[PDB]
Each structure stands twice: as C-alpha cells, then as structure tokens.
Amino acid sequence: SVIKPDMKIKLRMEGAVNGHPFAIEGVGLGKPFEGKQSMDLKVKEGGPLPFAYDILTTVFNRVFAKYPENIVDYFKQSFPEGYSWERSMNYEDGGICNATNDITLDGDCYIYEIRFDGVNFPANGPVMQKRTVKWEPSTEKLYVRDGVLKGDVNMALSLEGGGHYRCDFKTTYKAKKVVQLPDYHFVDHHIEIKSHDKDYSNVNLHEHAEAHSE
Numbered sequence: 001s002v003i004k005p006d007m008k009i010k011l012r013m014e015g016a017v018n019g020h021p022f023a024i025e026g027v028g029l030g031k032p033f034e035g036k037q038s039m040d041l042k043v044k045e046g047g048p049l050p051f052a053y054d055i056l057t058t059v060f061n062r063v064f065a066k067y068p069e070n071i072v073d074y075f076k077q078s079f080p081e082g083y084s085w086e087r088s089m090n091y092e093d094g095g096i097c098n099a100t101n102d103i104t105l106d107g108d109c110y111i112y113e114i115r116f117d118g119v120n121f122p123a124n125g126p127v128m129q130k131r132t133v134k135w136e137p138s139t140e141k142l143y144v145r146d147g148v149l150k151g152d153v154n155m156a157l158s159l160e161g162g163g164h165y166r167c168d169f170k171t172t173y174k175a176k177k178v179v180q181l182p183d184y185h186f187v188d189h190h191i192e193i194k195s196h197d198k199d200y201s202n203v204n205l206h207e208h209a210e211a212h213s214e
Contacts, residue, residue, distance in 0.1 A: 002080045003032050003063070008109035009039055013059065015099075015116025018128070022046025026060060028205075032076065035066035035209040038194075040202065048199035051121065052132045054157055057191055057205055059087070059099045059116055062151075062173065065187050065209040072182035073211075074149050078175035079105050087171040089155075095121035126157070126165045133158040137190040140169075144181045149173040153189070185213045 009028035016022065023046060028039025039060060043049060067073040075083060082104045089097040097118035104111045121127045140153040151171045156164040189209045196203040 001076070002105060003076045004108060005031055005033055006108070007032060009037065009061075009112070010109055011039075011060065011112035011114060013056070013112075013114040013116055014045075015114075015118070017051045017055070017097075017116075017118040018121055019119075020046060020050065022049060024056070030064045032063050033066065035064055035211075036207070037061075037064040038204070038206045040204055042203075043201045047201055050128070051118075052127045052130045052157075053193070053196070053200040053203060054132045054135060055089075055095075055097060055118065055127055056116065057135065057193065058089075058155075058169070059101065059114060060205055061101070061103055061110060061112070062187065062209070063103075063110070064207065065211050067211045068213075071185050071211055071213055072180045074173065074175060074179055074182055077179035078177060081176035082110075083173060083175045085171055085173045087169060089118075090168045090170075091121070091127070092166040093122055093125050095119070095125065095127060126159055131160050132165065133160050134193065135191050136164065137188065140187040140189060141184075142182070142187060143184045147181070148175075149182070151187070183213065185211055187211045 011026045013024045023044045026041040030037030063075040084102045100115045102113040136156045142151040153169045155167045191207045194204045
C-alpha cells in the first residue's frame with residue numbers, strides 16, 4: 001500500500017475571520033496506523049491573529065485515525081489519489097466557520113490545501129476575546145450518505161473562568177476514487193496545543209484519534 005507507518009505533513013491554510021484575512025503554513029509528522037500526529041504551525045499572513053487559535057486546530061485528516069480490522073477505512077483506501085472534505089462549524093452564539101481541505105500524497109508526505117472562512121463571531125464573545133482554553137475530547141459519529149462519508153460531532157471549548165462554549169460540526173468526506181463504504185461507526189478524538197508563543201505565531205499541535213464500532 002501507499003500508506004506507511006511513518007508519514008510527513010505539509011500544509012497551507014488561507015482564510016478569514018469576520019472578514020480579516022490570514023494564512024498559516026505547517027510542517028508535521030504522524031503515524032496513520034496509530035492515529036497519532038504532530039505539527040508545527042506558523043502564521044505567515046494576518047498576524048498577530050485577533051481571534052482564538054482553537055477555532056483553527058481541528059482544521060489542521062482522518063487518515064490519522066486508528067482503524068480496527070473490522071471497520072472499513074474510507075480514508076486509507078483513497079490514496080494515492082487522496083480525498084477532500086468540507087465542513088461547517090456552528091457555534092452556539094451565532095459564529096459559523098466553513099472549511100475545506102484537499103489532501104494529496106507526494107511520496108511519503110501528505111499535502112493539504114486548506115480554506116477557512118468564519119463569520120458572525122460576537123465582538124465580546126469567547127473567540128474574538130480569546131477566552132478559550134482548549135477543546136474537550138470528542139466522539140465523531142460517521143455514516144454514509146449518497147455514496148460519500150458524513151461525520152458529525154458535538155464539540156466544546158473549555159473557557160478560562162469556567163464553563164464551556166459549544167459548537168456542532170458537520171463534515172462531508174469525498175474520496176477521489178472509488179473505495180469501499182463503511183458501516184456507521186465512531187472516532188474518538190483528542191486534540192491539544194502542546195506549546196505556543198505569546199501571540200500564537202508559532203504553535204505545536206498534536207492529535208490522537210481512534211475509530212470503533214458497537
């Protein structure tokens with residue numbers, strides 16, 4: 001297979017939040033079969049970012065998910081051609097983020113082309129006022145719809161000062177070539193920023209994911 005235990009990551013994100021443009025590029029590595037990955041992100045345009053960095057982290061590849069033998073792996077199946085996904089993230093206070101990622105493979109490195117667009121975040125909200133701490137772990141529900149894979153997850157950001165800020169995710173994954181379709185299943189996720197400088201110009205982001213079924 002084209003999927004090897006150790007692979008590299010390279011990405012560029014171009015986006016905007018409340019109409020203000022920015023761009024971030026990253027370099028990382030991961031273990032597709034263990035569902036582990038790490039990366040170093042750097043703001044190239046639009047910094048210092050005037051919004052909570054956390055609204056970006058889950059946009060920074062389900063190929064990095066431990067898939068058991070009894071569960072069809074939609075993602076690892078799609079390479080070398082690769083796959084792409086679209087997502088809408090609806091926050092409880094009206095803020096909404098749309099994102100897309102086109103994932104291709106070059107040798108042993110995945111290449112991401114990411115677009116990010118968020119709007120309607122309240123000026124006094126947790127995002128614009130950067131009052132988030134981290135995302136809580138989550139469980140994504142994945143199911144097939146019209147020959148493609150859909151995935152929804154109830155997300156929540158812990159807020160500095162107590163409480164949580166809820167956001168609902170709705171994603172569509174599209175393999176660039178025909179692959180076997182899986183049965184309804186789940187993917188546990190745990191994303192964490194391990195380090196970063198004061199204004200988040202540099203960020204070290206890690207993620208751990210594992211799939212499973214009833």
